[PDB]
């Protein structure tokens, strides 16, 4: 996207979102990142929404095919699951490459740095979901380390009701439960996160209250499923 203006890439990412063209949206936001400038709050959200949708479709397809493949145990189902898996890994690697070159190193504010590090944990978590071989353990540790660094910053620099802090804790708790085989850590994190946010709600405006309680309900839904 080197010949298109940064502002035009951003404009077209917003159009692609409205058109539910998430692959285009991701390519436009990839082009915007590669312009080399830091991203605003809104632009970070566009980048995140685009790739979450793209990899979300790939994960859903991979799960369908992995399920069929396990019920079967010709080479077609395995071959096609492998194809989808490779395409998913390529998208995760692309996002991780954007964070590494050079979004994270240039992110100094807590809101941007926690946002990108949560992203890094998420896309390593997606890699871990399909990993088996010699690097599954290393991929899991890469996810844990990104989430942990993001947690440490958010606890120091953000209020307990901050939606990024809450969504980070939500996804790290899912990491603990689904990836790290640590359901007690998952439940403890979600419950402490929920309780500390509840006690901070009195400080918020009506609109911030709606934003925070929405994500607290997601924590509560998980706790209900897990206990």
């Amino acid at each position: 996207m080197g010949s298109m203006e940064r502002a035009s890439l951003i404009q077209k990412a917003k159009l692609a979102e409205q058109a539910e063209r998430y692959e285009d949206m991701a390519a436009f936001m990839k082009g915007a990142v590669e312009k080399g400038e830091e991203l605003s709050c809104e632009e970070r959200n566009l980048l995140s929404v685009a790739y979450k949708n793209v990899v979300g479709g790939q994960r859903a397809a991979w799960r369908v095919l992995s399920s069929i493949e396990q019920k079967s145990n010709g080479p077609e189902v395995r071959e096609y699951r492998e194809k989808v898996e490779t395409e998913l890994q390529g998208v995760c690697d692309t996002v991780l490459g954007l964070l590494d070159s050079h979004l994270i190193k240039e992110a100094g504010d807590a809101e941007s740095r926690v946002f990108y590090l949560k992203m890094k944990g998420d896309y390593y978590r997606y890699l871990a979901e399909v990993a088996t071989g010699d690097d599954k353990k290393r991929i899991i540790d890469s996810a844990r380390s990104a989430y942990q660094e993001a947690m440490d910053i958010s606890k120091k620099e953000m209020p307990p009701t901050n939606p990024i802090r809450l969504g980070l804790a939500l996804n790290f708790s899912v990491f603990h439960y689904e990836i790290a085989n640590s359901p007690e850590e998952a439940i403890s994190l979600a419950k402490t996160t929920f309780d500390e946010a509840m006690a901070d709600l009195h400080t918020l405006s009506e609109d911030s209250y709606k934003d925070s309680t929405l994500i607290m309900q997601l924590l509560r839904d998980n706790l209900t499923l897990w206990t």
Binding site: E17, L46, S48, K52, L170, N171, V174, I215
Partner: peptide
């Protein structure tokens, strides 16, 4: 177990 649905913004 639901992660953040960051599918719309």
């Amino acid at each position: 177990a639901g992660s953040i649905p960051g599918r719309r913004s």
